Design a protein around this ligand. Structure first.
Ligand code: MN
Ligand code: MN
Ligand code: MN
Ligand code: MN
Ligand code: MN
Ligand code: MN
Ligand code: MN
Ligand code: MN
Ligand code: MN
Ligand code: MN
Ligand code: MN
Ligand code: MN
Lengths: 185, 185, 184, 183, 184, 183
């Protein structure tokens, strides 16, 4: 069957609905209220071959922080639900993704023990309207609810959009590897 | 009885109305024209158990500075009015508040002598649309009209929203302690 | 009374934990690691928790797996005992001196795990206990309890004093956080 | 009420101290050192102790011997008042601002004496009071009371403010440590 | 089979290239530069490409023009063989050891040319081959293939080892990128 | 199945090793060194090798000779199992995290021995296991297997985590290198 996780999370700050298919075809259906995060979630779908559905409304008139955090939390929980007992999967994923001058390596373990090692050097404070501090917070929150070990390391890069997008491409392809089944097991 | 302070302050730049209940239940009713400041004033209510009512219109088309300053000034005066003779209260308040990776300590004395010692290190210039320089100015203006001694010290923190929100949480809980009655007196 | 229980059996360890947040300081700790037992006793005596920990494990390899699985189980029991966390102080703060050592702990039963760890332990072993396991104990406890936890050493030169002051401060900060806020 | 009393007569000093741990803030301090009297008053006012200190001594030499013997007697009086120390909070913590100064005090009525002292007092005299005597006051008090005491300055430029904030923080930390743990 | 061919004749050089992306490792390289031939052989043996390169040029001046025009022609042949690039892995990564040398290559058949080049080659000549030509080879190949290419040396002291490890890693990363993604 | 077996008896040690390159993760490790047994188990679990190690030795001196002779025998057993090394991937690469630790392993079953070792293990003992023996284990394994082996730590503060991540990465890199290149 297909491993699908779903989470609806409604707080005073945000209203979030997430659906992810680990065995998808790359369907991207993201409307988080944060356009740049939508663009990154689209890359998660296209490069991981996940089906990624995210719909959120939130207090973005304050800033994007609460929406960003609650979407990441919901995605992490949906990933955890889809993974189930995690029997027979590769479990580990590794990928170095270039995007022009940027190069970011991601290494991860669907271990059940949350840890984020974050070593990006994003040189500007905003990409579009998106606060670049929210990139670290997105992956921290996703790690916290999914229970994964996640290491993100920038080897090259000067354009903030390129650095962040390379991160999502590498994360997407590393996560695809980790979630795929180990045929020898 | 309940200690309630009220101040309406109308200038060429701003029109401000403030009502604070030191003996409240955490009612938050904040519409300052500055959404991030509203969010921080909500935390003042929820974490201090103050009832906090703030309504302001102002020249936010110039920037948020005048509104931020006049709201803080009015709040400080309302706090001073609510405190009265300050007989029998704890007078001093201390609290260290974490918010994820951030940790901010606040120490204060309802002394009648204004002083702000401000030692935050906010790494970005805007949270949402809110100019992070306005955090220091908010507490300076509040100190000036309330007459309190206020020390704010950041021990940890990398996310600007977390640092500022931890500051308001610690301030709220320190102020609650300082305003509560000393039963032994 | 808010009581949490967790029994966790792996190929490496067999762990049973019961904690009473509204206890009287009953300490009943046999983790297989004597120094950790001594620290868990302080949790009970200084936090006024009832703490029951029983574990066997592959300590012939090292104390790592037992230390980790005990901490994981305690965090889950703490989360279970806390329930909806309604009406509690939620935050706790305490600076504990122990002779020349002074350690501050600040914590929030927020549901969001984070460990900020700033101890400077000068030796590698207290008794047989590997001092690297102190950080791993609190990291694992944070991961299953959902706590925000900051530990900062302001003074200290004896490793036993530094670690014990940490547990005393943690115990008293956790007691404060779990107690009820009368106004709420 | 938990009252401690100590009369200490040396060739240098004649000191009488009485402290009520369960007092109301009664301050009656005449040590022969006016600034120390002001500080002991803050101990009563902010700790809600009743503090009676009367001393004569060889202040024509300097204030050192009087300062030392007063602190020794206070520490003994405090220990006597504490008794078996059963049921008390035992630990005390407080950060006290005084304008630009901010001093944290953490203590444990442990029975094991230790002073950790980290003030940065920028002048040598407040009035006629030698600022070296602040450290010696707390060291001697720790020696006879047997308490663990940590004093840390986080802010401060005025010597009077720094020292007064220290006594305010010490008084409130000591009040917390001597009070009963209701649970 | 995806086969690319390019014949490029200038006043300086006469170059003919044919590459089979779905080959068996057939190596047929006579560029006029023996060390480059040795490197192009590794492209075939380690990438399982069929690589045919024949060039004559003004090597009596130096190897520069031949090196550049060979690399330009290979990049064009690679682009021609790739076609619409539909359904392929697109990205390739490989770290190749060669004794003490270790070189990582990461590439994307993105269509956007970029060379990130971080080798530290300690000598100026391997045989008769000027080691400045290594960077120019990959820069020229990137320019005509439309590839994003990052080359990073993690270890290495022998220039022949460093350069050969680079071509082995490039060959295996390129093989991965050109192979088909079964799920797509 | 590709099985290698080596029995090595010195005046210091008596070692028997059997490895199945095409195994299912069967772990049967009794080297006399409990932490090394734990690491060899990870080799089986994460590499899907069948790993049988039985050794007795002069561990009353220290673990060095046992550690060394076990690694030598494993390297020989691996080489014997590889045979002509025809049709295999030959190269292996893997980055393995373990909580805060992250270790990359790159190797080539080249026949030319080399160890490039860049770990930063912050303590001298994990349990009773001397952490100097990690480098010596891989150096000896390289010497008898003839492999090119590069080990690089990118992150890590806990010695147990760093060493375990190294074995996980080595096991998965070795699995990749021994598997058949289908094309
Ligand atoms: Mn947040
Ligand atoms: Mn883009
Ligand atoms: Mn202004
Ligand atoms: Mn917020
Ligand atoms: Mn561990
Ligand atoms: Mn002890
Ligand atoms: Mn003296
Ligand atoms: Mn004064
Ligand atoms: Mn040129
Ligand atoms: Mn060669
Ligand atoms: Mn040796
Ligand atoms: Mn282990």
């Amino acid at each position: 069957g297909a491993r699908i996780g779903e989470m609806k999370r409604v707080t005073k700050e945000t209203n979030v609905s997430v659906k992810i298919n680990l065995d998808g075809t790359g369907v991207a259906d993201n409307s988080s209220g944060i356009p740049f995060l939508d663009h990154m979630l689209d890359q998660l779908a296209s490069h991981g071959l996940f089906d990624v559905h995210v719909k959120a409304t939130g207090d973005t008139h304050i800033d994007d922080h609460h929406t960003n955090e609650d979407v990441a939390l919901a995605i992490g929980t949906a990933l955890l639900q889809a993974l189930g007992d995690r029997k027979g999967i590769n479990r580990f994923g590794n990928f170095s993704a270039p995007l022009d001058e940027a190069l970011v390596h991601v290494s991860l373990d669907l271990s059940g023990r949350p840890h984020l090692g974050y070593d990006l050097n994003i040189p500007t404070q905003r990409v579009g309207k998106y606060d670049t501090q929210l990139v670290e917070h997105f992956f921290q929150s996703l790690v916290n609810t999914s229970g994964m070990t996640l290491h993100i390391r920038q080897f090259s890069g000067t354009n903030s959009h390129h650095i962040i997008e390379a991160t999502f491409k590498a994360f997407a392809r590393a996560l695809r590897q980790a979630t795929e089944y180990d045929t020898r097991r």
